[PDB]
Amino acid sequence: SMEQVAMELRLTELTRLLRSVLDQLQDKDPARIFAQPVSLKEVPDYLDHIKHPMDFATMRKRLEAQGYKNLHEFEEDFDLIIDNCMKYNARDTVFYRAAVRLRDQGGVVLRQARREVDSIG
């Protein structure tokens, strides 16, 4: 149907906008601490601690399959990255501190993204 196509164009354009959001958030992680999945070879107990691992490569795979229906879903995954790190790692660690800085800096990007998603519809 023509409606299915219109819906699909909306999803494509959301995907375009979320790709630019993802790029901007990942620039706030210049150490690449959150770029890839925590390695279960190197942290073999990880899944005992963290039930839903997340990272920027995994988000990018979902994004490119158009697997985010709305901004809320995308934000859910970003918050997992931060929240998983802040639980697994102690306050005094470069990992925790990186997550805090990513959260604080990302807030700005995500605030305007929400306005754009609502605005353009």
From Swiss-Prot:
It is found in: Nucleus; Chromosome. Residues 9-113 form the Bromo domain. There is a cross-link at residue 41 (Glycyl lysine isopeptide (Lys-Gly) (interchain with G-Cter in SUMO2)). Highly expressed in testis. This is Bromodomain-containing protein 1. It comes from Homo sapiens (Human). The lineage of its organism: Eukaryota, Metazoa, Chordata, Craniata, Vertebrata. It comes from the Eukaryota. Component of some HBO1 complex composed of KAT7/HBO1, MEAF6, ING4 and BRD1/BRPF2. Component of the MOZ/MORF complex composed at least of ING5, KAT6A, KAT6B, MEAF6 and one of BRPF1, BRD1/BRPF2 and BRPF3. Interacts (via PHD-type zinc finger domain) with unmodified histone H3. Interacts (via PWWP domain) with dimethylated and trimethylated 'Lys-79' on histone H3. The chain holds residues 555 to 674 of 1058 of the full protein. Scaffold subunit of various histone acetyltransferase (HAT) complexes, such as the MOZ/MORF and HBO1 complexes, that acts as a regulator of hematopoiesis. Plays a key role in HBO1 complex by directing KAT7/HBO1 specificity towards histone H3 'Lys-14' acetylation (H3K14ac), thereby promoting erythroid differentiation.
